[PDB]
């Protein structure tokens, strides 16, 4: 029935995962960002003459 | 109640094979993965003698 067809449309969700992993595997590159420090020391070279 | 639950767990055998095939063939044709250098410049005293 139309309402039953609507519930059927709700049921078959086990294909969206297949679809988007298909999208991902044929998609562009992956990447891995790296780590960075915080504050610093503000040093120099005093005894120069 | 359960009738259709066990019906659907049994019918989707036609889809599980598609799933394993597509995951394998995607594993075959995966593209390259490139890391990012990061927001820093790594330098050093190169020409020592």
């Amino acid at each position: 029935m139309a309402s039953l067809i609507y519930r059927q449309l709700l049921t078959n969700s086990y294909t969206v995962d297949l679809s988007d992993e298909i999208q991902e595997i044929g998609s562009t590159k992956s990447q891995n960002v790296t780590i960075n420090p915080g504050p610093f020391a503000q040093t120099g070279y005093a005894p120069v003459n | 109640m359960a009738s259709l639950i066990y019906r659907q767990l049994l019918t989707n055998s036609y889809t599980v094979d598609l799933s394993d095939e597509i995951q394998e063939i995607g594993s075959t044709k995966s593209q390259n993965v490139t890391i990012n250098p990061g927001p820093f410049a790594q330098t050093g005293y190169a020409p020592v003698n």
């Binding site: 709700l10 995962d17 | 259709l4 066990y6 659907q8 767990l9 989707n12 799933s19």
Partner: protein, 97 residues
């Protein structure tokens, strides 16, 4: 960039099954049959899952994979092909009763 990750193991299935029965033996009664009338789906059968760590799709696929090798699947397949062959022609005239 560690040495590697290490998947963890799990206890043998016997203790799981016995404690599963021990958990069954304190189920409610009226709400059980109250639930036993609503025919849900294949979807909400696995809607509420714990921590869903990139697992729901793979777990559903694994359920579908493992379900077809059960005794019930073999029994229904032998049912259907046996009746198809029986109706196909006069294949078995009279061997046993």
């Amino acid at each position: 960039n560690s040495v590697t990750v290490r998947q963890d193991l799990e206890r043998q299935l016997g203790e799981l099954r016995e404690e599963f029965n021990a958990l069954s033996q304190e189920i409610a009664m009226s709400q059980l049959i109250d639930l036993a009338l609503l025919p849900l789906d294949m979807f909400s059968m696995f809607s509420g899952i714990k921590s869903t760590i990139d697992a729901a799709k793979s777990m559903a696929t694994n359920v579908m994979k493992k379900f077809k090798k059960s005794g019930l699947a073999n029994s229904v397949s032998t049912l259907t092909d046996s009746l198809s062959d029986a109706a196909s022609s006069i294949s078995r005239g009279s061997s046993i009763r």
